[PDB]
Design a protein around this ligand. Sequence first.
Ligand SMILES: Cc1cc2c3c(c1C)C(C)(C)C[C@@H](C(=O)Cc1ccccc1)N3c1c([nH]c(=O)[nH]c1=O)N2C[C@H](O)[C@H](O)[C@H](O)COP(=O)(O)O
Ligand SMILES: Cc1cc2c3c(c1C)C(C)(C)C[C@@H](C(=O)Cc1ccccc1)N3c1c([nH]c(=O)[nH]c1=O)N2C[C@H](O)[C@H](O)[C@H](O)COP(=O)(O)O
Ligand SMILES: [K+]
Ligand SMILES: [K+]
Ligand SMILES: [K+]
Ligand SMILES: [K+]
Ligand SMILES: [Mn+2]
Ligand SMILES: [Mn+2]
Lengths: 500, 500
Amino acid sequence: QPAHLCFRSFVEALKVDNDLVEINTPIDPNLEAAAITRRVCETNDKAPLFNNLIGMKNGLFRILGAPGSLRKSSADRYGRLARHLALPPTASMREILDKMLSASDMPPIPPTIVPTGPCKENSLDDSEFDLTELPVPLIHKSDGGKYIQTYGMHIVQSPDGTWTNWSIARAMVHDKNHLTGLVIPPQHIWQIHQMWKKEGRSDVPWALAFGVPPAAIMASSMPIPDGVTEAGYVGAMTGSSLELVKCDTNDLYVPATSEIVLEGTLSISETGPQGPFGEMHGYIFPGDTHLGAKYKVNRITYRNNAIMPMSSCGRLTDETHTMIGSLAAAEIRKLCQQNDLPITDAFAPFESQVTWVALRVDTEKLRAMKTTSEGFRKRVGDVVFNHKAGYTIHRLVLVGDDIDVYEGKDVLWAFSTRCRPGMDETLFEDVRGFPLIPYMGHGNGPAHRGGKVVSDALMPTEYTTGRNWEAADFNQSYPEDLKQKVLDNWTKMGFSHHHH
Amino acid sequence: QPAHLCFRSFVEALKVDNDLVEINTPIDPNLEAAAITRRVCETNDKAPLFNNLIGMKNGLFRILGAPGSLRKSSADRYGRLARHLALPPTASMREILDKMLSASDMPPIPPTIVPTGPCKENSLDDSEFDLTELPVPLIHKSDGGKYIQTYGMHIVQSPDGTWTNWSIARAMVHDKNHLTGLVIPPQHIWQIHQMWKKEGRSDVPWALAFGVPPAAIMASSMPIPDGVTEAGYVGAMTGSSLELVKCDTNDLYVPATSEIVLEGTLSISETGPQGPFGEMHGYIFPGDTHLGAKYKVNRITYRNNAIMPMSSCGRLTDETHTMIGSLAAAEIRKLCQQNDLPITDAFAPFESQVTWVALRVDTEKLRAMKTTSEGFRKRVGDVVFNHKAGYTIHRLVLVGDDIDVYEGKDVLWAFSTRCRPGMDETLFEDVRGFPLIPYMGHGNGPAHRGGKVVSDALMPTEYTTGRNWEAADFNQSYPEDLKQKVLDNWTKMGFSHHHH
Ligand SMILES: Cc1cc2c3c(c1C)C(C)(C)C[C@@H](C(=O)Cc1ccccc1)N3c1c([nH]c(=O)[nH]c1=O)N2C[C@H](O)[C@H](O)[C@H](O)COP(=O)(O)O
Ligand SMILES: Cc1cc2c3c(c1C)C(C)(C)C[C@@H](C(=O)Cc1ccccc1)N3c1c([nH]c(=O)[nH]c1=O)N2C[C@H](O)[C@H](O)[C@H](O)COP(=O)(O)O
Ligand SMILES: [K+]
Ligand SMILES: [K+]
Ligand SMILES: [K+]
Ligand SMILES: [K+]
Ligand SMILES: [Mn+2]
Ligand SMILES: [Mn+2]
């Protein structure tokens, strides 16, 4: 099976790439696996595969940390992401995001049902598992629970059967047969949960699949539109129908090669303690526990030698930056274009803790609009901040054609030198806010509303007659023949490899 | 003579440090020397010493580029700055800035007059030099003149003789015996020029000394208080009286070991075309020429084998970032402390193109003030933005004790995650603005007023009961004994030098 369609194959790809470290001596799921993974993430090291977890029982489970984190060299920086998508490991962020968007103007390819798969190799009923006895990791020292679910896919379906959503949302172990987790608006898991609540008749049929096809976990982390089944979008993207198997205890369908599958229900009435958790913006607020969604687990099925992927999230750089940030930026790029806005490119700079998106503008198109900063700012912000795709993003930075939005340094340069504080910004207080950002949930204002801004780093002539500067840098402040002479004589004069 | 007290000795120190490249083949002052220097600055390479300039006449002149720029390794990143100050090359920014501030609570050590020095080895009168025939550099391709003066010290004295100011301000060649330059408020050269204008009787006696004692060029680039003679402050800092010699044609005094000295007058009536120039924020606006201050040159004196230092300024990182930014931050730190504000540290992040200063707050002191964000923001901004030391700075970022303001990454993290846009900021529109910033001089608003902001990245509990988070990073989210075990086993498990 190819790496983009089978997690087990993806792990073997990372080995072959020399992008994996296999750790075959015992590692404690209480903190040590997550501490090793956190260090990997902070240093862009190789992904850790923990083949010997203390307390692993009945084949449950190995752990792979840092599945979507960055590689050290600039040449294949995004190579672990590329390997989720059948892209070359030297793929640029633009090429990854274009791949993730490519299904947005293709017909879906619905999934194929098969009678069995590797995910049915082993099973445990209600009387045979206990979630408190599995080697579930404690990820950060002050976490309020052991977060089993950091990189699996929740699968829920609308009551009418017309929409099946796949998404990542965190969950922790509550007791031997329940989890608690985040289920919050505007997320699709919440939108579907509301539908079942309003019908009022039963709990939501649910499954959580860990170690799913890498191309599926990428779509699971992207805000594709309301009502769009991720399976059919992944199908279209990959050009193949995904193979799914039916769960044993309900009628949902899971990827045939899933490593571990939990089957049960998401309650429409019950809650339980959840959190705190060390989160994407780089913080944990110890003691910050709240009531959350509660799940009941009725069955576990799993591959022989099952592997649990884990995100040890926090400060830069992990899956919550590379996937949440980038994939929201991609969806924002598309949204803007569908709303007739001249945006060519979007990215969430890591330096902003993925709370900003930089939008590159086609300023030729902009000039033809014959508009102003204030008008344009308002228009862009009204499109993005009233849409789900803008939920996690608090600052949009508009930049002209000379800025590469995939380079944080150049976004910071443009922000710092082209956007006059106050005058060149519009604040948005009556839009949904992202409460996880410390300045929202733990700040001075309402946790769920406002706090957003559009910062215009377009210069005045970019709206009228065209750019009227040159950069004071080596590239633009010297003629081409001089530049080349200097570069040709550089090491000869005594001054100091692309891959590395 | 020691390196901090003699430019020629400083160049020999850089050689010995293996922080110099001597280029003994011919280099064109039309662009090529500045292009090599710009590349050095963009890559943190060794400083270039051009010993063979095309068109060098009568011993005038060699060029040293990148005199105050950064070194490649993290260990001696600021080593070229340290060498201006008799500090070890591994000195931290905190230690450099503390050295620059140390004279602020010492009595001045006034300079010593000596009868001669190396700067009198050679002389040229009015009938013997022509500034248009010297190998003056064209620094950027669209510059409006050849900027002879990028790293020399202007010397002017109040009419009453009580204040002698030393400062850096740019100047370019106008004709055979005149320069034009920037002389703008609130700068001391402008403050003194105003005094002579109001007296109305004569042009301002002036000298411009190039290749001055490195400790003097550092003070020349710092906004020490109004009325304070830089020579006496440098004296106090270094613990020694500086040796000065009298100019031949006026009664000002120059450093005895200056490489090149121009003597003449700064006009109280005449102006001439100046600019454009590729500037500190990374731009040039071609064709943007304005009338500026005009200087007449009556005499040149110079050392045998004279060396002209040159800053090829623009995008990161050069003297306009390392010296303007850092030294303004230092003065701001002191100003805040003198105004009873609990600021421990200040730095202008390079990532902000030195348009921001991050102020580290002693939050124990802050709690004892029993204040609020809005009050505190206003107080800090009213102190800094109505003072000359705040002139170049458009955004102040307040951060708590856990942030190292000398690390841009940590300042960006705190800004992005702790300061809610709008709500946590106060805008300042009735303060002097820095017009060089593109969003000021070429922006949507008044070039000389407003555009400033105080951004509070203190969290709410930092004002009341204390920090209530831990970072979700390796350092803070794992116990000490685990951290050490992981680090001890890192290379054994298979994962990947301070100097490099
Ligand atoms: C890649 C990743 C993604 C998330 C999460 C984590 C990781 C690794 C973890 C589990 C490590 C962290 C956690 C977070 O704490 C971060 C977070 C992000 C957004 C909302 C809430 C929390 N999380 C998560 C998430 N969405 C959430 O609704 N609660 C979540 O718990 N997300 C984001 C979510 O998948 C995207 O918003 C998708 O668009 C949602 O799918 P649709 O609703 O559009 O179908
Ligand atoms: C290290 C350096 C510094 C400056 C300048 C450059 C370099 C290398 C050059 C020449 C390369 C660039 C140029 C600038 O274009 C940048 C600039 C900065 C601040 C004001 C105007 C321009 N410049 C300069 C500068 N001050 C200016 O009044 N016109 C100037 O021309 N400065 C700043 C100035 O020295 C400081 O503000 C001092 O505090 C002034 O001394 P006091 O007035 O307090 O005694
Ligand atoms: K999704
Ligand atoms: K702007
Ligand atoms: K000065
Ligand atoms: K704040
Ligand atoms: Mn969805
Ligand atoms: Mn001064």
